Design a protein around this ligand. Structure first.
Ligand SMILES: Cc1nsc(N2CCCNCC2)n1
Length: 185
């Protein structure tokens, strides 16, 4: 992939975060806190899961960014509609407005309905996310393995503005405290 030259500077939107998340001062890192983080509730916040959106909204063009997932046991990454459900239980699927991959219990899977098994030989420490709005494409790249393709969602029906999507995952095990970090360009 030669997608690096569509690189965009992504920052996290505090106001969308689950109330247990801690976003860094530079808005480039997020991690699970050990308690509720002393913020008011609002209609933007993901209530049931440790999720947060990027501040940027995309309705055209080609966009690329990279996320560091080093030492995490569980996470979800990708893009979603600006109008996704925030409150209650829901599944990550294109029908619900999400184009995502994840790590869960040592398996990587794409957020199709039902979910698709991914085949990754080299556990990634960084993930590249490529969106082509006009083509209807969301692609995922293994930066640790020379940029090798992980998954492509094609014929996507975005049906509105897109936002970068993140889930740091729960930390019941004590092995998933590490942050998601947006990597420098
Ligand atoms: C609805 C919700 N968002 S975070 C959260 N935690 C309590 C459950 C134990 N793990 C810590 C995070 N619950």
């Amino acid at each position: 992939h030669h997608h690096h030259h569509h690189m965009v500077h992504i920052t996290l939107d505090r106001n969308t975060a689950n109330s247990w998340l801690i976003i860094s001062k530079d808005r480039r890192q997020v991690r699970m806190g050990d308690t509720h983080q002393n913020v008011s509730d609002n209609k933007e916040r993901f209530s049931n899961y440790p999720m947060v959106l990027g501040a940027q909204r995309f309705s055209s063009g080609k966009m690329y960014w990279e996320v560091d997932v080093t030492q995490k046991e569980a996470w979800d990454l990708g893009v979603c509609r600006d109008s996704v459900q925030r409150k209650g239980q829901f599944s990550l699927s294109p029908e619900n407005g999400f184009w995502t991959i994840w790590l869960w219990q040592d398996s990587y899977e794409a957020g199709t309905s039902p979910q698709t098994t991914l085949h990754i030989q080299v556990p990634p420490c960084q993930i590249g996310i490529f969106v082509d709005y006009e083509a209807g494409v969301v692609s995922f790249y293994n930066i640790t393995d020379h940029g090798s393709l992980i998954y492509t969602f094609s014929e996507c029906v975005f049906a509105g503005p897109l936002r970068p999507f993140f889930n740091v995952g729960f930390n019941y095990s004590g092995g998933n405290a590490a942050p998601l970090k947006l990597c420098p360009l």
